Write a protein that binds this DNA or RNA. Structure first.
Lengths: 48, 101, 256, 95
RNA sequence: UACAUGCUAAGACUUCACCAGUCAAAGCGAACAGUUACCCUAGGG
RNA sequence: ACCCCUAUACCUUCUGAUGAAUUAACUAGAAAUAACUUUGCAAGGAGAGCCAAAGCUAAGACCCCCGAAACCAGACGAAGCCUGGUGAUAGCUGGUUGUCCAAGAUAGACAACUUUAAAUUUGCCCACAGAACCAAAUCCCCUU
């Protein structure tokens, strides 16, 4: 029902984190915080 | 056995961050200088002596369950709960003569 | 002593009277593991290949100078420290020499020409305040072994080898004037000495004026282990001679 | 463990200890926590911080590890830029 | 339900050990495989 | 001498059946890492190598006996048998030899209890007060 997916930072590259998302819902994009640039940036998933 | 219960009894000296009690339900409530955790564990925010008191329970307006339970009380009842306090011992600081300029 | 007076009157000490000291001889009395569930981590990953350096503090160097064990009128090498027994280093057990240590920076009053493998900024400052010289030199395991105990090397019969250059990692350290590297440009040293003198609030004494300037300026060029001797020589200790080859190819090899 | 080896008659170290533990010269053994890189997706941040930690060992564990390593691993090592240099000596201990 | 379910750090709890587990002030930063009547050996009832 | 009174052989294993005719001989605890004790020398020790933030060197003092089926190799006889591997191994019994003094027996899921030595300061017994909404007592605890 749910999938453990990974999102990769668009900024502060090389930073990624894992969340859970439904099998049927659309592609998952969040606004997370990364310490590479120490700021809030968007994360877009790349691999389930 | 969850090993829950009072960890520090009345009159016991306590340091900052010491855990006073671990509970599954709010058997004891946080009083003065006693903080609570996610597990509703009562820890001490100051350094001093633990006291257990009985106090009037006036719950937060946002707590709708406690609020309407309070409303359903007659004009004769007042709710009481057991609270845990830490009476702080040491003064929070002193003034020292550093330099005579 | 009163004890020898007591011995006067006691029976003669013989093999029938001896006794061990009480307390010396206990009587013979006759009629998943924990370390597995823990994850591996590389605490000791490359330990046998890590370089080690024995610390010579300035307290210790002052103490040795202070009891006549290290002579500060001559250059201070590793050989002098080992001979004075102020430092004990094992080439096996991957020691790579001596590192100077700032302990005793205050209360160090000695004008020395020391040669150490590593030196901290504060220790260099402490030596150079008193009119001294610090050089940081490199010794490979073999040359380090020969330096620390030269006499057992001279009984081995082999011609003196030329010491190797630092590996790639240690080349930037030893080619730098801030740490007084022995492969650094002499021209940049006055700048570094003035920087240290300015930072630590002492005037930099120009060594050229003191009568020990010739000694304080004595360095041995790289690919030399001992001061007065050149690689390729053979020490004949029995009849007190030095044998130097005159071959062209040998001399080319030893002067490389 | 091997107290007397068949070639030298010497004690032998257990290399698992060497691959899992750091021995401080003072007698303290430092280890990593189990699961510090396993299944991190569900672990709470507090738990992850707890697991990403260098942790000391028991007295019994320490003596047992001292029994399974030889004297070479109990010697004073003067490494160049060891991050654990300040921990090799013990300070202000009053037993 | 949430995306600071971030980083660090005093002090404590804990299933009687261990391994694991909890809570947390201040601070930075952010919201606000069967079988043997061929069986065999050491023991036990 | 006996008669009287007193006196459930011993060993092992159970919480409290086993073996032994008798005499003599034979017959069973093997390891110094650390620590401790006693010396030497001492920021150094050590008769290379090793260790050292009082250490190092030396000594002393800790780790039993008997008892399978098997498997393998090579012979010898007509699977067996023998020699070797082999003091095989695993279980489970049984046995483990002078004296005195001191300390020294019941939770449990390694721990508990126990010994020796060392450092230090409270330990036990406990009075008021004190520990929850949905009987016994227990925890805590100054005095003594």
């Amino acid at each position: 029902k749910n999938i453990l997916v990974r999102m990769v930072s668009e900024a502060g590259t090389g930073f990624c984190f894992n969340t859970k998302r439904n099998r049927l819902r659309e592609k998952l994009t969040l606004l997370h915080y990364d310490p590479v640039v120490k700021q809030r940036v968007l994360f877009v998933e790349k691999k389930k | 056995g969850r090993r829950q219960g009072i960890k520090k009894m009345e009159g016991h000296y306590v340091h900052a961050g010491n855990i006073i009690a671990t509970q599954r339900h709010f058997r004891w409530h946080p009083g003065a200088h006693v903080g609570v955790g996610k597990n509703k564990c009562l820890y001490a925010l100051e350094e001093g002596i633990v006291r257990y008191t009985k106090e009037v329970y006036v719950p937060h307006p946002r707590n709708t369950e406690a609020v309407d339970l309070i409303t359903r009380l007659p004009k004769g009842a007042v709710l009481y709960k057991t609270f845990v306090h830490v009476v702080p011992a040491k003064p929070e600081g002193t003034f020292k003569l550093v330099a005579m300029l | 002593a009163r004890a020898l007076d007591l011995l006067r009157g006691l029976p003669r000490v013989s093999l029938a009277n001896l006794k061990p000291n009480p307390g010396s001889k206990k009587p013979e009395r006759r009629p998943t593991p924990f370390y597995i569930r823990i994850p591996k981590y590389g605490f000791n990953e490359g330990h046998s290949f890590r370089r080690q350096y024995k610390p010579l503090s300035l307290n210790r160097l002052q103490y040795l100078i202070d009891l006549g064990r290290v002579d500060p009128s001559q250059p201070i090498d590793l050989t002098q420290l080992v001979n004075g027994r102020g430092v004990t280093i094992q080439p096996l057990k991957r020691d790579y020499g001596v590192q100077l240590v700032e302990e005793g920076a205050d209360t160090f009053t000695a004008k020395v020409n020391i040669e150490v493998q590593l030196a901290s900024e504060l220790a260099i400052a402490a030596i150079e305040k008193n009119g001294g010289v610090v050089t940081t030199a490199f010794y490979d395991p073999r040359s380090l072994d020969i330096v620390c105990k030269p006499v057992p090397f001279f009984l081995r019969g082999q011609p003196i080898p030329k010491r190797m250059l630092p590996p790639e990692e240690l080349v930037p350290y030893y080619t730098d004037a801030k740490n007084r590297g022995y492969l650094a440009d002499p021209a940049k040293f006055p700048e570094a000495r003035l920087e240290l003198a300015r930072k630590y609030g002492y005037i930099l004494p120009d060594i050229t004026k003191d009568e020990l300037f010739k000694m304080l300026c004595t360095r041995k060029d790289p690919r030399q282990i001992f001061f007065g001797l050149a690689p390729g020589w053979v020490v004949n200790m029995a009849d007190k001679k030095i044998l130097k080859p005159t071959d062209e190819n040998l001399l080319k090899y030893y002067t490389s | 463990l091997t107290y007397f080896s068949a070639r030298k008659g010497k004690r032998k170290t257990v290399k698992a200890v060497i691959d899992r533990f750091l021995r401080l010269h003072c007698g303290l053994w430092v280890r990593r926590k189990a699961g510090y890189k396993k299944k991190l997706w569900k672990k709470t941040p507090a738990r992850k911080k707890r697991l990403r930690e260098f942790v000391f060992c028991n007295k019994t564990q320490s003596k047992l590890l001292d029994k399974m390593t030889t004297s070479f691993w109990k010697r004073r090592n003067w490494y160049v830029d060891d991050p654990y240099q300040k921990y090799h000596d013990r300070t202000n201990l009053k037993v």
